[PDB]
């Protein structure tokens, strides 16, 4: 906040660091999808409509999001959203099984080797990204969101968010969506 105020004061422009994290929601059904984006949709663990996952933004994931774009709607999650998403809908993957994160014991049992021995340890490793994001985030089952309570705000979903809504990078706006899907 104050970095921006100071650069302004000095007649410059503070420019933020590009976002290290995105959350992704598949908003397309499963049939009539072309092989390539279809494949990508799976490797991002997004194989049913309205499921979601977090992605670390680097060049090599950035081009996945490109390839997959008219099927998903994504952006940058707030702490608030990441917190409610894991609390309400966070399940862990253990011996192939999908287990709810009812107690902190469950996470430590599995992520303890990496640090991470509470749910907010998990959240932290997600929003800050870094060290064991791979593992912590993979530990999280894809989130099974509902349809948005209050609608999609748009006449038709399968245009770009810029074109008249849904699909593509809606940036910050992702949060309002996911909050009605959560």
């Amino acid at each position: 906040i104050q970095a921006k105020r100071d650069a302004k004061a000095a007649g410059s422009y503070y420019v933020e660091a590009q976002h290290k994290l995105v959350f992704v929601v598949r908003i397309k059904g499963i049939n009539k999808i072309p092989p390539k984006p279809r494949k990508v949709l799976q490797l991002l663990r997004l194989t049913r409509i309205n499921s979601g996952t977090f992605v670390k933004v680097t060049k090599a994931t950035l081009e996945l999001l490109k390839l997959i774009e008219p099927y998903v709607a994504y952006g940058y999650p707030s702490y608030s959203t990441i917190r409610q998403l894991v609390y309400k809908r966070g399940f862990g993957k253990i011996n192939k099984q999908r287990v709810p994160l009812s107690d902190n014991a469950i996470i430590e049992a599995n992520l303890g080797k990496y640090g991470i021995l509470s749910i907010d340890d998990l959240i932290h490793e997600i929003i800050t990204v870094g060290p064991h994001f791979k593992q912590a985030n993979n530990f999280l089952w894809p989130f099974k969101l509902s349809n948005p309570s209050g609608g999609w705000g748009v006449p038709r979903k399968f245009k770009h968010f810029i074109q008249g809504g849904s699909f593509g990078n809606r940036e910050e706006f992702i949060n309002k969506l996911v909050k009605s899907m959560n």
């Binding site: 059904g29 499963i30 049939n31 999808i33 194989t47 049913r48």
Partner: protein, 185 residues
């Protein structure tokens, strides 16, 4: 709906009990499903599986295959296990002492093994002596020895063996077997 990546409701390709109805066999099986469940000891978990196998997957361990396996260094005092039956081999003369746990022994096999001053015990007899497989030396027979597998992979240039009911010259020996009759395989 779910874009499946995997066949749903697929069962493991693995036997889970023996196919047999042999009362006694289901008891051995009942033994080691306990031993393998309630111990670690890799050995039990193996025999428990080996019990489910079919007669092809349990080819005979020979008496000489045992005699040789004992020539291994630090072997001679181990007790060789054969979850299957042990046959006799006329071709070794010197046959050592040692105690052999199997499922079945042919007449001549426990003959050899005993007369050499050695023992022939059933598996559950083994189970009590060695609940954790102590000094056991598991042995498996030559699977790929069957007459059946000679024909597997039969094809041009595959070098395999035709399914020919009655052999000789005049029996699939001409065109396609020699450069002089059409060509060669």
């Amino acid at each position: 709906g779910i874009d499946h990546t995997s066949k749903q409701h697929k069962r493991s390709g693995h036997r889970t009990a023996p196919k047999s109805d042999n009362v006694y066999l289901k008891l051995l099986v009942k033994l080691y499903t306990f031993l393998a469940r309630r111990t670690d000891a890799p050995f039990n978990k193996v025999v428990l599986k080996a019990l489910f196998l079919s007669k092809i997957n349990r080819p005979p361990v020979s008496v000489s295959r045992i005699a040789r396996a004992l020539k291994q260094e630090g072997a001679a005092n181990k007790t060789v296990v054969v979850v299957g039956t042990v046959t006799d081999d006329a071709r070794i003369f010197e046959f050592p002492k040692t105690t052999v746990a199997a499922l079945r022994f042919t007449a001549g096999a426990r003959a050899k093994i005993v007369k050499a001053g050695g023992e022939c015990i059933t598996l559950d007899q083994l189970a009590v002596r060695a609940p954790k497989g102590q000094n056991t030396l598991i042995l498996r027979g030559p699977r790929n020895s069957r007459e059946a597998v000679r024909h597997f992979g039969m094809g041009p240039h595959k070098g395999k063996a035709p399914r020919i009911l009655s052999t000789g010259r005049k029996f699939e020996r001409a065109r396609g077997r020699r450069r002089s009759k059409g060509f060669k395989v």
